[PDB]
Amino acid sequence: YEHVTVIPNTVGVPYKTLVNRPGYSPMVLEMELQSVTLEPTLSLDYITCEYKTVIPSPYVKCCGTAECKDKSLPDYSCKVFTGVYPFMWGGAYCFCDAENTQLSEAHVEKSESCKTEFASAYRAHTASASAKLRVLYQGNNITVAAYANGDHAVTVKDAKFVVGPMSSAWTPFDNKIVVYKGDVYNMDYPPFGAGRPGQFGDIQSRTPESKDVYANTQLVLQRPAAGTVHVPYSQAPSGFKYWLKERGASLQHTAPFGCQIATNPVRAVNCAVGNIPISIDIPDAAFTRVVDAPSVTDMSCEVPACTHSSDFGGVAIIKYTASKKGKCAVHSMTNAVTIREADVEVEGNSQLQISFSTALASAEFRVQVCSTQVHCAAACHPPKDHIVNYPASHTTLGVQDISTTAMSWVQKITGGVGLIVAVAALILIVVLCVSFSRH
Amino acid sequence: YEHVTVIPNTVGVPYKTLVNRPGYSPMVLEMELQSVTLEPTLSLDYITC
Numbered sequence A: 001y002e003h004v005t006v007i008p009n010t011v012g013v014p015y016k017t018l019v020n021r022p023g024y025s026p027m028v029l030e031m032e033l034q035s036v037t038l039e040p041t042l043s044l045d046y047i048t049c050e051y052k053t054v055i056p057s058p059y060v061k062c063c064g065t066a067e068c069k070d071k072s073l074p075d076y077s078c079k080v081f082t083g084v085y086p087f088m089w090g091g092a093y094c095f096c097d098a099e100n101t102q103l104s105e106a107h108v109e110k111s112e113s114c115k116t117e118f119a120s121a122y123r124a125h126t127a128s129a130s131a132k133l134r135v136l137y138q139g140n141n142i143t144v145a146a147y148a149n150g151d152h153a154v155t156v157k158d159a160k161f162v163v164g165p166m167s168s169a170w171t172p173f174d175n176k177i178v179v180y181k182g183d184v185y186n187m188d189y190p191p192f193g194a195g196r197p198g199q200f201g202d203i204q205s206r207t208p209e210s211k212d213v214y215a216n217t218q219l220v221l222q223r224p225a226a227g228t229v230h231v232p233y234s235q236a237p238s239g240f241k242y243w244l245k246e247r248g249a250s251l252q253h254t255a256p257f258g259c260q261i262a263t264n265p266v267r268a269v270n271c272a273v274g275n276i277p278i279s280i281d282i283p284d285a286a287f288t289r290v291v292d293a294p295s296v297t298d299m300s301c302e303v304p305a306c307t308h309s310s311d312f313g314g315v316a317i318i319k320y321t322a323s324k325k326g327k328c329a330v331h332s333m334t335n336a337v338t339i340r341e342a343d344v345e346v347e348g349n350s351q352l353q354i355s356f357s358t359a360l361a362s363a364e365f366r367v368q369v370c371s372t373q374v375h376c377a378a379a380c381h382p383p384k385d386h387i388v389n390y391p392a393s394h395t396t397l398g399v400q401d402i403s404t405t406a407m408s409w410v411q412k413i414t415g416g417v418g419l420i421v422a423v424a425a426l427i428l429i430v431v432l433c434v435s436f437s438r439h
Numbered sequence B: 001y002e003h004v005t006v007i008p009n010t011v012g013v014p015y016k017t018l019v020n021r022p023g024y025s026p027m028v029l030e031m032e033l034q035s036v037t038l039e040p041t042l043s044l045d046y047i048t049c
């Protein structure tokens, strides 16, 4: 047998789905979402890290002049100066008072630290869904894992489960993302080869190991301090290290629906959006012919007390009489109320208790068991607490709601005098019809 | 659970107060006044003999 259902995309909220098959006892299964993972694409746009500035020993000269020869290196720069008269510990370096010259040059390269610490920019666009389910089958909890895209089919305990596709294509991610060691950020990185100094992307590297790099750091030299031998540099401050200082809030806090985000691999998990379709092919072995199930008769219901709450605040006692000892499923056919229990053993002329959750001020509903219906009417009361920690979406109430006793009040209010006014209009128009024929 | 009540200021007369809580069996408590003491201020104006 094949059964298809749909459930809200929520985690930790048990769901009852009643599959019925003529000629056999109908059975209701409990399905729970352990977690749902969304794996986005991974197109590594590039990486970046802190840079090291290499400035070899400056070239000094006397009574002669140096010269700049271009170097095919990133952001390589050079300069010359004249008239410098450096002094060392033992005295002047050389005699030429002003005929001397100084040549300096520098460049910037990647740091070995990049091999361990860095920030990587990807252009992830799409994603795939995988999920974990817990199912109450034959009186035991069973775990299943499958891709929640409507394609993956999984066989367990002789039954075939298919999940997905996700109703909503929404994702918390973005086309372009930047990832640190364990943090993710939605942020539009500058295009490769156009890094703006002092900002993210100031140095661009294709891979942590690729020797080729790109840089933009305005490396300008300056005239050295008089009387000293040294090289000054106007090295641009590293925007990469700085961006780590102003990273801002991570996406695990800014993600709508709070989809928890992990790494290695990067996934977004546990966000409630849309719903999921599930198709279950269940072999008939689990199915039991109706004759096998014990009968039921003399059904009475009572509610000693009930309390509409996020928990199972409602308790109902039912008196039942059955043919023989045996298991029997229990369900509520009204979505406004949910029942924690799935089935129960029935011996005969006995009673039982059931714990349920509702949201109506007055709970008036039918309950199905052993292919029989029993009414239940009660007046719940508001609990004391206004907010709770654990989640509970079972007790969902639409705009339609039970006015309870006040229902009668509005039923009494609905009475109007339109009938009498129409009667008066008819009477006047007829007594006029003596003179009013067809106008 | 919190319950508030008021009882006449009298001694030796038992009082029944029924506290009820939905979802549980209501319970009625017996409260009796053994005695009530009023201690006034003490500002010794003076003494004599």
Ligand SMILES: *[C@@H]1O[C@H](CO)[C@@H](O)[C@H](O)[C@H]1NC(C)=O
Pocket: A136, A139, A140, A141
């Ligand atoms: C299934 O999970 C529920 C959750 O609390 C647990 O109480 C129960 O013992 C588990 N096993 C079953 C229902 O067989």
